[PDB]
A paper describes a structure:
Mammalian AP endonuclease 1 (APE1) initiates repair of abasic (apurinic/apyrimidinic) sites and other toxic and mutagenic DNA lesions and performs critical roles in base excision repair (BER) and single strand break repair (SSBR). APE1 hydrolytically cleaves phosphodiester bonds at abasic sites, which arise through spontaneous rupture of the N-glycosyl bond (depurination) or by the activity of DNA glycosylases, which initiate BER. APE1 is the major mammalian enzyme for repair of abasic sites, which impair DNA replication and other processes, causing DNA strand breaks and cross links. In addition to its AP endonuclease activity, the exonuclease activity of APE1 processes BER intermediates generated by bifunctional DNA glycosylases and removes 3´-blocking groups arising at strand breaks.
We also sought to obtain a crystal structure of APE1 in complex with one of the indole compounds and found success with 5-nitroindole-2-carboxylic acid. The crystals used to determine the structure of APE1 in complex with 3 were generated by soaking preformed crystals of apo APE1 in a solution of mother liquor with 5% DMSO and 100 mM compound 3. While this concentration of 3 is two orders of magnitude above that observed to form aggregates, our result indicates that some fraction of the compound, perhaps a small fraction, is populated in the monomeric form under the crystallization conditions. Compound 3 features strong electron density, defining its pose and binding interactions with the enzyme. Additional evidence for binding of compound 3 to this remote pocket is provided by the Fo-Fc map calculated using a model that does not include the compound The 5-nitro of 3 accepts hydrogen bonds from S135 and R136 and the backbone N of Q137, and the 2-carboxyl of 3 is contacted by the hydroxyl and the backbone N of S164. The pocket features many hydrophobic residues, including L62, I64, I91, F162, and F165. Together, these nine residues are among the 11 that exhibit the largest NMR CSPs (Δδ ≥ 0.03 ppm) induced by 3, demonstrating excellent agreement between the crystallographic and NMR results. Regarding APE1 conformational changes caused by the binding of compound 3, superposition of our two new structures for apo APE1, free and in complex with compound 3, reveals that binding of 3 induces minor changes in overall structure with some significant changes in the remote binding site for residues including L62, D90, R136, Q137, F162, S164, F165, and L318. Remarkably, our results also show that the indole compounds bind at a pocket of APE1 that is distal from its active site, with specific interactions defined in a crystal structure of APE1 in complex with compound 3. However, the activity assays show that these compounds inhibit APE1 only under conditions that permit compound aggregation and not under conditions that disrupt it (with detergent).
Author numbering: 37 to 123, 126 to 318
The structure:
């Protein structure tokens, strides 16, 4: 018999100025859409239009780069579009920007980890943005050994990128770092997204690059702030969720951090969007 009832979470108002008072100049939105076509049918684009981000990162598009829905043409102000998908119907990431990036790359430079369309790297003047859909550990943890290999290769790759330019990593990292990051830590310690191996990998990623978890850095003691809820058992209406989607930043970008938002009420997927405001 289920132990959780509703838990309130009200994302605070958008702080659009840096701690020094500098207005935000860049708004990035990241969203695991759980199928680009399904998300469009569920009015996901109408939400993007209201949010009006400068850069939109999408994960789990499940769409081949050569089968993109024609409705994507109804997104003005995000004309530079980049997509990665497996060598259709699984994984897939997208990055849509108002301004053209200096360079766009796909993957993490390792053949073993570059066949499932999980990563886009876009270099800009002041920083390099990476969007990722991290491999899920799987039912029965059958992909956990592979996920640990992925974590090490990704950490090495990001540390290399950060040594040249400040980094922003966003996306569905498929781990709730700490107990405060999910509604049911006790029942999920042996499930994908909350194994000690995955949590330890997330801690290693923050320490080694290094990177700061933008949301937790700003709201260190705030509970019930999630970005994913299973479609089953009315989990979203009870706020039985997990915070799997993040914006991780280089320490040098902390003075530029205005806010890191969780758009809780935005429908269209089993994940909600997250939004970052930077004063670059
Ligand atoms: O590196 C930077 O300082 C920077 C890149 C960038 C891109 C957009 N955009 O609209 O795609 C807006 C503001 C931006 N700032």
């Amino acid at each position: 018999a289920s132990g959780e009832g509703p838990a309130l979470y009200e994302d605070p108002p958008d702080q659009k100025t840096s701690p020094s008072g500098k207005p935000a100049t860049l708004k990035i939105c990241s969203w695991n859409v759980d199928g680009l076509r399904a998300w469009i049918k569920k009015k996901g684009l109408d939400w993007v239009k209201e949010e009006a981000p400068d850069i939109l990162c999408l994960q789990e598009t499940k769409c081949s780069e050569n089968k993109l829905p024609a409705e994507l043409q109804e997104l003005p102000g995000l004309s530079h579009q980049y997509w990665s998908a497996p060598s259709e119907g699984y994984s897939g990431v997208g990055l849509l920007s108002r301004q053209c990036p200096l360079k766009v790359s796909y993957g993490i430079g390792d053949e073993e980890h570059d066949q499932e369309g999980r990563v886009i790297v876009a270099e800009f003047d002041s920083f390099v943005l990476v969007t990722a859909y991290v491999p899920n550990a799987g039912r029965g943890l059958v992909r956990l050994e592979y996920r640990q290999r992925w974590d090490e290769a990704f950490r090495k790759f990001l540390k290399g990128l950060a040594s040249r330019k400040p980094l922003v990593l966003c996306g569905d990292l498929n781990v709730a770092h700490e107990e405060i990051d999910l509604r049911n830590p006790k029942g999920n310690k042996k499930n994908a997204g909350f194994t000690p191996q995955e949590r330890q990998g997330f801690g290693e990623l923050l320490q080694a690059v290094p990177l700061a978890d933008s949301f937790r850095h700003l709201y260190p003691n705030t509970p019930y702030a999630y970005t994913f809820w299973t479609y089953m058992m009315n989990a979203r209406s009870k706020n039985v969720g997990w915070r799997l989607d993040y914006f991780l930043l280089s320490h040098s970008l902390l003075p530029a951090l205005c806010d890191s938002k969780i758009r809780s009420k935005a429908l269209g997927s089993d994940h909600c969007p997250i939004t970052l405001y930077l004063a670059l």
